[PDB]
Amino acid sequence: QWQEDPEPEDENVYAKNPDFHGYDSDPVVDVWNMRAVFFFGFSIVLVFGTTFVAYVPDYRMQEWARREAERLVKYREVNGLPIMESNYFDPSKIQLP
Amino acid sequence: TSLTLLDLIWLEKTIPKSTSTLHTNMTTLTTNQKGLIKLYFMSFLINIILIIILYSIN
Amino acid sequence: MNPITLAIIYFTIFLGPVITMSSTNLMLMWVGLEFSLLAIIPMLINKKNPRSTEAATKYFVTQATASMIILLAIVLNYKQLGTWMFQQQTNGLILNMTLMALSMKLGLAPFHFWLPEVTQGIPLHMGLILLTWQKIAPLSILIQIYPLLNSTIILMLAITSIFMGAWGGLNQTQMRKIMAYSSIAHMGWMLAILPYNPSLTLLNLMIYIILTAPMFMALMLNNSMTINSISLLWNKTPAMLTMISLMLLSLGGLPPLTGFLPKWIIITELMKNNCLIMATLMAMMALLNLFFYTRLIYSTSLTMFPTNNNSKMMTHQTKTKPNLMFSTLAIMSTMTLPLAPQLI
Amino acid sequence: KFYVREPVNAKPNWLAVGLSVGASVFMWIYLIQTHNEDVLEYKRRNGLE
Amino acid sequence: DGPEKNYEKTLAILQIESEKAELRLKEQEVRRLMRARGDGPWYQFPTPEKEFIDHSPKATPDN
Amino acid sequence: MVKRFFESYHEVPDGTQCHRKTYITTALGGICGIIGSAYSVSLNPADSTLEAVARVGRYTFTAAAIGAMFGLTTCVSAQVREKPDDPLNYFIGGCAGGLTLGARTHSYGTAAMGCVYMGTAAALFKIGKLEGWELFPTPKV
Amino acid sequence: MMNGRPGHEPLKFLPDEARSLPPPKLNDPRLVYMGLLGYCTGLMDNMLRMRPVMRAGLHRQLLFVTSFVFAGYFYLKRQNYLYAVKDHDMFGYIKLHPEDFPEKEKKTYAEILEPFHPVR
Amino acid sequence: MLKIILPSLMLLPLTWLSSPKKTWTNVTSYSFLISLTSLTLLWQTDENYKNFSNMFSSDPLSTPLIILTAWLLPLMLMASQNHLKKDNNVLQKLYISMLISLQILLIMTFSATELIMFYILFEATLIPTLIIITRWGNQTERLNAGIYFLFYTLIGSIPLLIALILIQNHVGTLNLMILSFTTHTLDASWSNNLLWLACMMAFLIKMPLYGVHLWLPKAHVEAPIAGSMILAAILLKLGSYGMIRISIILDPLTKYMAYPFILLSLWGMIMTSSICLRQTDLKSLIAYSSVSHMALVIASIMIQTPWSFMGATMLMIAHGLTSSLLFCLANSNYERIHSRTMIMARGLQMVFPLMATWWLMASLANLALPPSINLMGELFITMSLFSWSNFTIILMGINIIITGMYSMYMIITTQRGKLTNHMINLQPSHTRELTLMALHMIPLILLTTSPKLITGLTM
Amino acid sequence: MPSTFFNLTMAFSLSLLGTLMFRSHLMSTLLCLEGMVLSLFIMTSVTSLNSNSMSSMPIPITILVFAACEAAVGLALLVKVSNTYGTDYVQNLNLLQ
Amino acid sequence: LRYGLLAAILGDKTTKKLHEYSRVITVDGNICSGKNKLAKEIAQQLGMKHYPEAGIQYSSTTTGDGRPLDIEFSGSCSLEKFYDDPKSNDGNSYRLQSWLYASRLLQYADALEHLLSTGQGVVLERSIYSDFVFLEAMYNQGYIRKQCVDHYNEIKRLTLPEYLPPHAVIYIDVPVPEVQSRIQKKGDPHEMKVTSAYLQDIENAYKKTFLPKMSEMCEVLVYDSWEAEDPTKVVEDIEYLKYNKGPWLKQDDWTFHYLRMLVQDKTEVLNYTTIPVYLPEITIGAHQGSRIYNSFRELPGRKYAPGYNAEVGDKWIWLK
Amino acid sequence: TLFQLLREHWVHILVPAGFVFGCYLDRKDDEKLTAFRNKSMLFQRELRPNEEVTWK
Amino acid sequence: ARQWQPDIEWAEQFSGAVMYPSKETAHWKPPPWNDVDI
Amino acid sequence: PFLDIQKKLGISLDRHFMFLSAEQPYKNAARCHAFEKEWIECAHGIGGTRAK
């Protein structure tokens, strides 16, 4: 038989210390690691980032496009133009082959 | 059909391990020389004749 | 080996590439190639084992008959032109004689069969001076005559050297033989690029020298002969493990390390020179370099292999076999792909 | 006294340390005077200051 | 900052890379015509030197 | 005269001139088998010169068989489909050639390997000659 | 190419026109990368020679950073000269042959007819 | 962009120059600050795409991928902690260094003005994922899995290099907006067809569909949790960003070269959903689930509908967060029982009440919940493929039947049941693991709340 | 002259066929190598005599000195091979496989 | 500085160092034959260096800290465990014998380094030219196997003939009942437990294998126990020996310099005894080797290279 | 002011220092791409007299 | 519990003269480590 | 050359017997000396591709 160390048994970390939070087995480092990832990850990134995301203005130009669509539909119905022409580019501007 | 026959055994037999078997067969047919310099120099003579024939057709 | 003949043999193996890269007389760089052959032979035999004399006479008979074929090419240049230097209006037979002889001394794949057997019988610090420094000089005359080289024989030599450097390393599990085969694939690359841009031949030569020379110094550092002997590195010297891993995968040629950049610039100049499917075949058959290098990297630094009980004295004793040149060419290889236009 | 066999690098080679530090100091001084001389030479050569 | 910074920065990037396209295609065509004809500086393969011809009168009269 | 004899592959399209089409494809296979049998005899020698020339005859019989039936199957596939400008006749001719190579060496796995690999190579050669690709280009750039 | 260019001084590292080029700055990212390379050279050499990789060999790390920045500044000046003289030879050949490199008067998008390829 | 790239590059002396007690807390807190400073790319007040420099650009399709990279780095560094509670300090810092370097080059790959920079940092992923898998894998077959991953991706990526250098020497600069705007139509030529296959085969291997799907379950059952989360949640979809960005060169040829890849995609997703009905390994079941959810977006980018691209990008970030949460739950069960068989560990809801709730939410986002981005992306892909052909909806209907069956099969197998009582070592759920799946799921809930960020390139 | 030069080219092609095969000994191959030395001297001296380029008369003594010096190196190499073996033959050298 | 070629060309040649009072003596016998007392008296009388018998803990007290390390660091074998259970299922006998042979290989390297450095002679009890007799006595008693014998013969074929043989081989022969009487009179409770057949086997193996192997090539002087108790006659017969027949009379100064190059650094000395041959007696597994390396580096003095440990008190760590 | 606390809390500088260096190098790259400035036809405006640059 | 490491049967498959054997490569001796043949 | 050290140092070491029309001992001109002289002075820095 070759010289190998045996399989190390999975000891109960909750039997070692009761306030085991999943981090390194030093309990002060474990508790402050939990406080650091909760305050730096769940507190100031999810909530502040949700605030920054919800107060990004006119994302993908949607609010300005709705206001310019209201202004354009109001202008076309005031001056009597049809509400969308069939061709976008002008046939007088185009050069046919 | 789907687990054993297609994914485990035949897509594995066709895409990775067919090229693995082909390259294994190519390496066993390439690196199997007897170490004699006579056989090496006869192969050298044959490929020198090949370079001469390639020049004469080009 | 007294220091007098040590200094003269090292000065002659320095001198032969110097007169080869300096002179423009074709017989004068034949003379430099003969100095290269002459000064390599007692370094090959100086360990005095029975495999070393066999490798030395294999090297002598192959390199000496290649010296006679290139001397036929120089004498037929003297008949056809009356000068010595290869000029434009010469016959293609003499240039094919030159390319066949220089591929014999360089070790490309219709002539490669001496190179693993020559590298197997010799110690590692002769593989340092044979695998890098010896192959500067036949490459340098082949750089010097680059409009005259015929692209059909150049590309068939390139395809066969890429194919057999792919197909010689996977079966065979010794380190000196496996890096002779990987070197054969690397001169397949720097013989593929040769009539198109010789500055990239110089670039692939310089990258292959700074990628193979510290790797042979790392083999020299523990005298790791086999794949299991380099697998014992985690108990001999574990500190070099990620550097020899980065150098191994860079000699295979993965980004963001430097060995992709010869493949990238060879593919760049080859698709500028309109050669599509043959450079495609070269870059597709280049992956077996990563097959033997991924098996070798799983041996040395990604799986810890079984050691033995007598390696604990290798943990005990101090080691001074690291050199400064290993570390500076190691990191100058393994992190220079963001410096690649200045490396051109 | 800790090691029973005295190491080769127990004391630093002071000539090597001074040669390395003075070579880097001379090489930085040469680089900054080469860069200032090349900037002034390029400003003389292009005709625009 | 405003969208004008991103727009004019994008226009500077597009100008720089479009001129990079025209000089890379121009570099390929210049190198192709230089290897074809050799009129300019690049790709000039060397000739033997003019100086080492003996221009002294010789023993043979006509050579 | 060997190269201009071998350039009857492209001056007349497939679906015509089938006997000398099969003859030049058998001659290409015989040249490749002669140099492969010379490589095999010079690398791994037999115990007798009779066994070495039997190895030469077996190797050139295998290579002349795959060349002859590859050229004949792509010619009769051009006969059946009556289209010269496609790569699928070269695909099915390369698959029939690899099938006959694996039937000669008596293994159906390398018959399928030779079918897919030489069908890919034959379709690549036909697609290169259709789109004017250069195998060995002169340096121009 | 550059070996065959006329007016070439043989085996010259920096000719007189490299002084006519603007020299590179010390804040350039290639020299910043080479200073990082010299520090990584000292870290890797101390790691292999079994040293404290930050504390020990500070003079060797300083020589590595200084020699790496020195070689990189000199090679960067030479490579900037080589790419500038490639641009000069190309622009001179363009000025020599406008009938071999004509101006491409591209027609406008109203005049040309791109074929429309709908996906559905 | 450099305020996201360069402090992530300065996370390396944070790893290597701190105390070994404090590496995990400093690197996780500052990588959460990296994600907070990587929320800055959402300042699109116009359809002009953000180009910070000539090196790096920000795209509306690439920005939830770039927040998923910078958000996926602390979720990997949480999950590696009890995985590496017994290994020593320099291997722990090498794992953190390889994870951080993978994050740096994934950020730099997603910010690509130029497609050859994209190829350099696309093939730069192949080293550190192989370092994670073939050193810290816990079974025998990790060498074979690393060889499979490395060579599937390199035999895909070599003709991508061939076609990129050929396209560059044909037309000029490989900048993405330059080659978007100045380009021309491609002629129907067979060399252009081989150019199509050459430039698409790398992404066709990296997203698993049939023929070439087989490297993913080997490199997911032989991976660690950080390698499995990166290979299931952003590094698989790096090729999907490439498959999006390549197709603007060559859009006229996709409408007849598209059909075998949509065919292989749809029958591969039916057969891989059918594979997941009978699977022993839970990590392999989530791996073939990722194969089916990638065959969907293979069909979705092989069609060029804009509706397809929105359903594609929604499926990208929904599949990344859902498969990362499911693989983290599989690592939690592997941590408890030291095996990955679903059959040997049943009834876990009796001892884990809230881990049953996170199991329920992950597999009930895998089964595509309607306000979630999974059915939002799959319904938009269903809309686009029914616009492509009216007979295709029965295939994806059979797929959604068997994806409901494998998701609730995994719930009913490993969560509900009799509670196998031969395990003393079912220790209760860590605060690490519960907040790790909370920081997985609460971005999916907020992404459900605001789906304007995830609309992709094309509306 | 072209008959003499083409027969010297035939003598080199014959000695190429001689040194490119092995019958029983490495020494007959080295005799073929020295036949290449003699054939290249005769070819170089015939070329210099009929071209009358007497400034390149340093070249064939350099041919003789360098090629016979490497021939002498190979002759003592066969001395070291027979010293380390006791035999001499071509089939003896298969120990590097 | 260090002994390189640059130090060798200035005049550090060993022919000026070597004189008549510079010989390699090995003093040899069975178990408890007076070899350490005779070696101390030989080195005291001729002025040579008394290298002692290299044990399992030779290398820890030779290089590094100087303290003997623990049972699993420089051990994984015990002489007491071999004397308790010789037919071991753990393979203790090969681990003891191979660790002892590599330890006396390091002792022969340090003795050749000392002799070729300062010119003073050295003694070496139970050297590597006589270390094979313990393994072949183990094999003739049946404690190890035939493949173990061939692997140790491969290790000895790698490590022996690159070195030089000892000048003088003193053997103190003593009969097997007197070996048993002195090993009972010593009083060790585990070394008492050895068998008399092992001592008889190593004695007639010594008298039939080692002495024709060594008497035909170098100088061998034999002595009885009562004749080698008083050492003045022993050191005078050492001093008045001719030293003619031997392999030390044909090498030159650069051959001695290449021997010092092969001997002075230990990374080429100890490399050939840790070659990979995977016999299960000496094969340390990967987890056990990683645990012993990551407990070896946390020992004080062995964390870094020597002369570079700031936690112990190696000064000038800032600029070195 | 303790040496152990300073040695174990100097590592917190680097990623804010990387943030400051990244913002500085991004604003240095902002100075390079200014060849199009107040010249695009969407934003071609007459410059107000309190400023000499339209965007910074 | 532990990760898998190579054993004797994994280390001995790299220990031949060649990796992939054949009918003619089965007689290949492993070479000596000091490169000297007895 | 590759390393042009003869052109750099300005000293001819192998360059004075390079072609047939080099200088000869005791001024004895070779055959085709005028043809080689006119060939080099017609290829006087023209370049190889234009000179052929």
Ligand SMILES: Nc1nc2c(ncn2[C@H]2C[C@H](O)[C@@H](COP(=O)(O)OP(=O)(O)OP(=O)(O)O)O2)c(=O)[nH]1
């Ligand atoms: N198995 C084994 N035991 C060895 C080997 N070399 C030495 N020993 C053991 C035998 C004894 O237990 C011890 C050597 O004791 P000595 O013969 O030196 O006796 P002691 O120390 O009393 O000194 P003395 O001979 O009276 O001067 O080491 C070896 O290679 N193998």
Ligand SMILES: [Mg+2]
């Ligand atoms: Mg005694």
